[PDB]
Amino acid sequence: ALADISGYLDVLDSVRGFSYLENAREVLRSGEARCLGNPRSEPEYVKALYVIGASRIPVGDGCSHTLEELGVFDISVPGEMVFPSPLDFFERGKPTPLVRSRLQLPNGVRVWLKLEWYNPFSLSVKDRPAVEIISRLSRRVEKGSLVADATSSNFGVALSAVARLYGYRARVYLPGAAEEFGKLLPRLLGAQVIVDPEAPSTVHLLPRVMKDSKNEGFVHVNQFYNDANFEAHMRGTAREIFVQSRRGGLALRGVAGSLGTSGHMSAAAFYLQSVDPSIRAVLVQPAQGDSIPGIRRVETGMLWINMLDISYTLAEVTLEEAMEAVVEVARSDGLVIGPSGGAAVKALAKKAAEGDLEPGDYVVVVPDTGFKYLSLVQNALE
């Protein structure tokens, strides 16, 4: 039988560790889940179901229910696109668009672009971890409390908007080289902003944020380590790629993406490889020396991409090469993508040139809009 999962989400408070993902993987591979005589007594299984996108759980003895029956494939979006609040629109105005590009790559590699700027608060992929993180402290941490993090531009904006929505205050710490929109827009949204001119990277701010947290008593949400980040992308970004590829008739042979926190691509890889382990994940490595906003090299410390059982391929991409792809996609599709989106397109283009990819449909996650990066666009047209 079917019950609403909403009544069992306290298991998100109490399940720890990655062992529950064995259940997620097996439910996805088999396309079904076994009924729980006592759902309460199997919290890891309930969490597995939530993380893959189920809105319902199977209840009883001996029965089983399909992904479909569990609500994994339920249509979210009202046909008329009317929403009673911005949060409801974040939650139900999904999937984010998946749009076939007319970019021509060698070897039958067809490019689709997933447009994560379609998230309303930060115009970026970062809404999803912000919502998930804030919503799940929202029972134990007191309203009016300060939450904070080290961030590049997008999550600081996401965090500021979402914290306030849920009744919290936000503080955002950014390196000197962050874009001005990351420094300014959080203030518009009601947050405090701290820029460290000296910090050479976003993760270099983390020790200061942790020290300040101990002295000042604010909640350090730590997107780089907070599993709700990964889980948000499992139930959202990754579930969407899966459902979109199926209902859209793609022959999904891989995904391509970039890595900051590693949240969105680790989820994409893990989810899709659960259904079909041969699906490739092609991932961007900002070339040494270069800085591409929002993203980093794997060696500098990433949680999910390293700890989870996922196969991926790297590809080196310079800032110059990423911006060339931004120009190519703009001239080809009339779509203005961000530097990191361009990096992911280029990575896919390289692996396509090398003959490494089966012909078929490949989904590139585009983290944000290129409108935000006028100085990088200016340099790229020279």
Ligand X SMILES: *Cc1c(COP(=O)(O)O)cnc(C)c1O
95 or 338: CB nearest ligand X: 338
Q: Considering beta carbons, is residue 31 or 37 the nearer one to its own copies?
A: 31
Helix (H, G, I), strand (E, B) or coil at 99: strand
186: preceding bond cis by omega (within 30 degrees) = no
Count, residues near its own copies per rule CB under 8 A: 65
Considering only residues 18, 145, 327, 356, which one is a binding residue for its own copies as defined by CB under 8 A?
Answer: 327
Task: Count other C-beta atoms under 10 Å from residue 353's C-beta.
Answer: 13
Taking CB under 8 A as the criterion, the residue among 223, 244, 274, 340 binding its own copies is 244
Write out the binding residues for its own copies, residues 112-141 only, by CB under 8 A: 115, 118, 120-121, 123
CA 368-338-299 angle, 5° bins? 90
Q: Is 261 annotated as a binding residue?
A: yes
- Comparing every residue's Cβ against ligand X, the nearest one is 294
> N- to C-terminal Cα distance for the chain?
62
Site for its own copies, residues 246 to 285, rule: CB under 8 A: 247-250
DSSP states of 200-217: SSSGGGHHHHHHHHHHH-
The answer to whether the CB of 379 falls within 8 A of the CB of 130 is no
Confirm or deny that 264 is annotated as ligand binding.
yes
Among 43, 71, 97, 360, binds its own copies (CB under 8 A): 97
190 binds its own copies, rule: CB under 8 A: yes
Interface contacts to ligand X, rule CB under 6 A: 124-126, 152, 154, 258-265, 293-295, 338, 340, 367-368
- Give yes or no for a contact between 81 and 331, defined as CB atoms under 8 angstroms apart: no
**CB 134 to its own copies: min, Å:** 11
Residue 363 φ then ψ, to 5°: -105, 115
Closer residue to its own copies (CB): 58 or 342: 342
Query: Whose Cβ is closer to ligand X: residue 67's or residue 163's?
Result: 163
Nearer Cβ to its own copies, position 37 or 248?
Answer: 248
154 annotated to bind ligand: yes
- The annotation status of 66 as a binding-site residue, yes or no, is no
Structure letter (DSSP) for residue 238: I
CB atoms within 10 A of CB 369: 18
Chain-centre distance for alpha carbon 89 = 17
Which residue in 333, 327, 326, 328 sits closest to 366, CA to CA?
A: 326
Q: Choose the one of ligand X, its own copies, none that binds residue 258, judging by a C-beta under 5 to 8 angstroms depending on kind.
A: ligand X
Separation between Cα atoms, residue 319 and residue 340, nearest integer Å: 9
Cβ nearer to its own copies, comparing 244 with 285:
244
Whole-number Å distance between alpha carbons of 165 and 376: 32
> Rounded distance, CA 270 to CA 307, Å?
11
From the CB of 70, what's the least distance to its own copies, in Å? 17
- Binding residue (CB under 8 A) for its own copies from 60, 71, 93, 360: 93
Q: How far apart are CA 266 and CA 264, in angstroms?
A: 6
- Contact set with its own copies (CB under 8 A): 75-87, 89, 93-102, 115, 118, 120-121, 123, 160-162, 164-165, 180-181, 184-185, 187-190, 243-244, 247-250, 326-327, 330-331, 333-336, 369-372, 374, 377-378, 380-381
Residues at the binding site for pyridoxal 5'-phosphate are 154, 260-264, 340
